[PDB]
């Protein structure tokens, strides 16, 4: 939903394109293998540099939007497997910390 | 005898 007057603090009125930025964008076609580990997509970093949504995100300091993620994976009735399509809020990436845990590395 | 004495739309 759009931000209410009580929740919003910015005094300038935001732009709501709603048809040029509120639309399904198809990102990529990552291949699922038998030894596949899994992938993550960060939002709205995925839509930062494409579309009118990308242009509005680059042009405006403040951003607020929901999302309708439609992950698609077609396979035949003789294929098997399940995917955990999940939305992890504030998915902070950690590192192996050098493996031994004594490096204080940070993800790039 | 003298008479002088909240931001909106």
Determination technique for this PDB entry? cryo-EM
- The Cα A96–Cα A104 span in angstroms is 9
User: Taking Cα atoms as reference points, which of A44, A64, A41 lies closest to residue A54?
Assistant: A44
Residues A55, A4: contact at Cβ < 8 Å? no
Q: Supply A22's token pair.
A: 């509120």
**Prior bond of A44 cis (ω within 30°):** yes
- The Cα A56–Cα A44 span in angstroms is 12
Q: Supply A85's token pair.
A: 């399509």
Residue A51: what are its φ and ψ, rounded to 5°?
A: 80, 175
Identify the burial level of A96 via C-beta atoms within 10 angstroms of its C-beta, where 0-12 means exposed, 13-18 middle and 19 or more buried: exposed
Q: What is residue A89's three-state secondary structure?
A: coil
- What is the number of other CB atoms lying within 10 angstroms of the CB of residue A22? 14
The contacts of residue A96 (CB under 8 Å, 6+ apart) are A105
What is A1-38 written as a DSSP string? -PPPTTT----SPPP---SSSSS------PPP-TT---
Residues A50, A78: contact at Cβ < 8 Å? no
- The Cα A34–Cα A49 span in angstroms is 32
Tell me chain A's radius of gyration from C-alpha atoms.
Answer: 19
- The Cα A12–Cα A79 span in angstroms is 53
User: What sign has the CA pseudo-torsion A55, A22, A26, A95?
Assistant: positive
Q: How many CA atoms lie within 13 A of A21 on its CB side?
A: 19
């Amino acid at each position: 939903s759009y931000c209410s007057d009580d929740d919003a603090t910015a005094v300038d009125k935001p732009t709501r394109p709603d048809v040029s930025v509120n639309r399904f964008y198809t990102l990529d076609t990552k291949l699922w293998e038998k030894s596949s580990k899994g992938w993550y997509w960060k939002f709205p970093d995925v839509l930062t540099e494409t579309g009118v949504f990308g242009q509005n995100a680059q042009f405006h300091y403040l951003y607020r939007s929901g999302f309708c993620i439609h992950v698609q994976c077609n396979a035949s009735k003789f294929h098997q497997g399940a995917l955990l399509v999940a939305i992890l809020p504030e998915y902070v990436i950690g590192t192996v910390a050098g493996g031994t845990g004594t490096e204080d590395s940070h993800p790039p | 005898r003298v008479a002088d004495m909240n931001t909106q739309v």
